[PDB]
Amino acid sequence: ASRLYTLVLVLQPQRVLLGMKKRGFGAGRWNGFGGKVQEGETIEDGARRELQEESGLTVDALHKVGQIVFEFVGEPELMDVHVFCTDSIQGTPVESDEMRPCWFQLDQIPFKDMWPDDSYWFPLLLQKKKFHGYFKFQGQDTILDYTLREVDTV
Ligand SMILES: Nc1ncnc2c1[nH]c(=O)n2[C@@H]1O[C@H](COP(=O)(O)OP(=O)(O)OP(=O)(O)O)[C@@H](O)[C@H]1O
């Protein structure tokens, strides 16, 4: 019972781009760019499309960095999130009614205003490591249990 999602982090040597979600589930947090994979599109195609829709950026080269499964107690569907990274983009980030982009220096990542699971795997992403993770949440603020392991192949 899992649904496919993508998450894209535009990570450059000195900075990372995040977007403040304006509405819906998880509004008020800085997150990567992503969403549900559509019928007839590959996971990577879905990741490229979501980055454009949510940030206005065009990505050519994408790299798989992680796979994270999110469980929300009381919600039947698991989120099967395929995480990707790019340092190679075109365009300028665009603010829309749904999302506000902002660049962050790597030592100023706003963890207090991000999903709690980011504090576990973002440090791996910054050190160019690949990972498989699982987080079980109660509501939007509490991690009940989790697992996280580094892998060589995502
Ligand atoms: N680290 C994280 N942990 C948990 N949830 C996260 C997360 N990062 C992140 O973006 N999310 C949530 O993941 C969800 C992604 O789904 P979404 O943005 O609503 O997209 P959709 O599948 O509806 O398609 P879209 O509207 O085209 O983007 C949102 O509810 C975000 O709050």
Numbering used by the authors: 3 to 156
Passage from the reporting paper:
It recognizes and disables oxidized nucleotides through removal of a pyrophosphate from the damaged nucleotide, which subsequently prevents their incorporation in DNA or RNA. The substrate recognition site is adjacent to and mostly separate from the catalytic site and in MTH1 it contains a hydrogen-bonding recognition element in the form of an Asp-Asp motif.
Interestingly, in both 8-oxo-dGTP and 8-oxo-rATP structures we observe electron density for all phosphate groups. This is possibly due to the fact that the structures were produced through soaking of apo crystals rather than co-crystallysation, and we hypothesise that the packing of the proteins prevents the catalytic machinery from cleaving the phosphates on the timescale of the experiment. The 8-oxo-rATP nucleotide is rotated 180 degrees along its axis compared with the binding mode of 8-oxo-dGTP. In the 8-oxo-rATP structure the space near Asp120 resulting from this flip in binding mode has been filled with a buffer acetate ion, which itself forms hydrogen bonds to the purine base. Mutational studies by Sakai et al. have suggested the necessity of Asp119 for the binding of another substrate, deoxyribose variant 2-OH-dATP, with D119A abrogating turnover of the substrate completely. In the case of the 8-oxo-rATP substrate, the presence of the water in its original location becomes unfavourable, thereby reducing the affinity of the 8-oxo-rATP substrate for MTH1 compared to the 8-oxo-dGTP substrate.
